[PDB]
Design an enzyme around this catalytic site. Structure first.
Site, PDB file in Angstrom:
ATOM      1  N   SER A 159      19.389  17.619  19.114  1.00  0.00           N
ATOM      2  CA  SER A 159      18.445  18.410  18.928  1.00  0.00           C
ATOM      3  C   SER A 159      17.822  19.375  20.056  1.00  0.00           C
ATOM      4  CB  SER A 159      17.157  17.659  18.301  1.00  0.00           C
ATOM      5  OG  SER A 159      17.306  17.386  16.987  1.00  0.00           O
ATOM      6  N   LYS A 164      17.815  23.037  19.346  1.00  0.00           N
ATOM      7  CA  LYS A 164      16.393  23.960  18.740  1.00  0.00           C
ATOM      8  C   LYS A 164      15.777  24.994  19.676  1.00  0.00           C
ATOM      9  CE  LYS A 164      15.865  20.734  14.915  1.00  0.00           C
ATOM     10  NZ  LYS A 164      16.951  19.600  15.129  1.00  0.00           N
ATOM     11  N   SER A 218      11.250  18.222  15.132  1.00  0.00           N
ATOM     12  CA  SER A 218      12.368  18.261  15.232  1.00  0.00           C
ATOM     13  C   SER A 218      13.226  18.348  13.716  1.00  0.00           C
ATOM     14  CB  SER A 218      13.244  17.446  15.830  1.00  0.00           C
ATOM     15  OG  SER A 218      14.493  17.638  16.351  1.00  0.00           O
ATOM     16  N   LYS A 247      11.496  19.340  24.436  1.00  0.00           N
ATOM     17  CA  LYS A 247      12.306  18.965  23.426  1.00  0.00           C
ATOM     18  C   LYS A 247      13.288  17.664  23.470  1.00  0.00           C
ATOM     19  CE  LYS A 247      13.159  19.579  19.197  1.00  0.00           C
ATOM     20  NZ  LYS A 247      13.643  18.218  19.272  1.00  0.00           N
TER      21      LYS A 247
END
Length: 369
Positions: free
Chosen positions: A32, A35, A95, A215
């Site tokens: 993730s 992203k 997420s 993140k």
């Protein structure tokens, strides 16, 4: 000091100077964390004006179904139409993969075209070792048939910690706003409450004063990973930990590891102020060829600091004002007249994640002719 992660790198946001590294160049799965590249194209579309924060975004079959039964971090989207800002919040805070995909189709028509966009963007940034097949970070086996044409069924996006640092840096520096989102420990998504996956934020288990990004990412191949940014002791640090060793009694190992990395950085480096606003770093003038002639005293018109190891035999040579050569008049007070560059001789790893070494603008503190 050694970090309990397979790969990691830490950099001072502003100059991109490398403070710590461990196998930071080998491309690896980042889950993730992907992203971030995604979100950069979104802000770039907001900036260009093609979309706006309140723009309604449809949620097609592919992204919509992916949420009823795909153990892929998502949130209910039964209304199949949400705001750009809503998806953005859902993407960075929870997420949510359908949030990411949705935004991508909205910006490029299809996730595929969007991927080509992120492949191009990375090349712009000088990252030429990346592998991008999707906008989420999931493994293709999770996407069934909705995988990039040519990509393998179990392929995963791949970036080096070094590469990630660059991405995080470019995002934060160009769109500081993004921090107003990642920062939130919880937010609202069209009514229901979404929770952040970042446990180093305010009121959370692995809290660490100063944090506000960036993140997380977890995948079997990527491991417990997290990109974190923070302002500690007046300095902004971008952290990339991507493959934290799995500790059985600590689900927050990735943050513990990050917190561990920061204790090192703060006790090892500091920001020493070299020039005071309004002053001059070596009675330092830059040529003009019409009025007064000699001098503009070129001056700092904010306070200038440099990263310095603590303890180091005598210290740094950031002596250097060059001018930009001797210029016409009239010269208004405040106009940039030269640059103070730090000739860093304490390079860690490749030294910097940018080909540019820190140079601070020196302004004219008087008008000429």
């Amino acid at each position: 000091f050694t970090i309990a992660a397979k790969h990691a790198i830490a950099v001072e946001a502003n100059t991109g100077k490398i403070l710590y590294e461990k196998d930071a160049t080998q491309p690896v799965e980042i889950a993730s964390i992907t992203k971030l590249i995604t979100v950069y194209l979104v802000y770039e579309a907001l900036e260009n004006g093609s979309i706006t924060l309140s723009t309604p975004v449809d949620i097609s079959d592919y992204p919509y179904q992916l949420t009823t039964n795909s153990e892929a971090s998502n949130i209910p989207m039964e209304a199949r139409n949400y705001t750009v800002e809503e998806l953005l919040e859902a993407t960075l805070v929870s997420s949510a993969n359908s949030a990411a995909i949705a935004l991508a189709e909205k910006i490029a028509g299809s996730e595929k075209d969007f991927v080509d966009m992120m492949r191009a963007k990375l090349l712009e940034w000088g990252i030429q070792d990346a592998t991008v097949v999707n906008t989420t970070g999931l493994n293709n086996e999770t996407l069934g048939d909705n995988i990039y044409p040519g990509s393998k069924k179990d392929e995963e996006n791949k970036l080096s910690a070094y590469d990630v640092a660059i991405v995080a840096r470019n995002l934060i520096k160009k769109y500081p706003q993004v921090l107003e989102i990642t920062k939130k420990p919880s937010s609202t998504f069209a009514g229901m409450t979404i929770t952040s996956t970042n446990y180093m934020l305010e009121g959370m288990p692995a809290y660490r004063g100063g944090f506000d990004g960036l993140k997380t990412g977890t995948t079997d191949k990527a491991g417990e990973s997290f990109v974190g940014t923070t302002v500690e002791k007046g300095m902004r640090v971008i952290t990339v930990v991507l493959n934290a060793d799995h500790q059985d009694n600590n689900p927050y190992a990735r943050f513990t590891a990050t917190s561990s990395l920061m204790d090192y950085i703060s006790s090892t480096f500091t920001l020493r102020k070299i020039v005071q606003q309004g002053d001059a770093y070596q009675d330092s003038k830059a040529p003009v060829q019409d009025g007064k002639e000699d001098t503009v005293i070129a001056v700092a018109p904010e306070d200038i600091y440099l990263i310095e190891r603590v303890g180091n035999q005598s210290s740094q040579s950031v002596q250097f004002t060059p001018d930009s050569k001797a210029i016409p008049a009239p010269l208004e007070a405040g106009t940039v007249v030269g640059h103070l560059t730090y000739e860093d001789k304490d390079l860690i790893g490749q030294g910097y994640i940018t080909t540019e070494r820190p140079s601070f603008e020196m302004v004219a503190d008087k008008k000429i002719e």
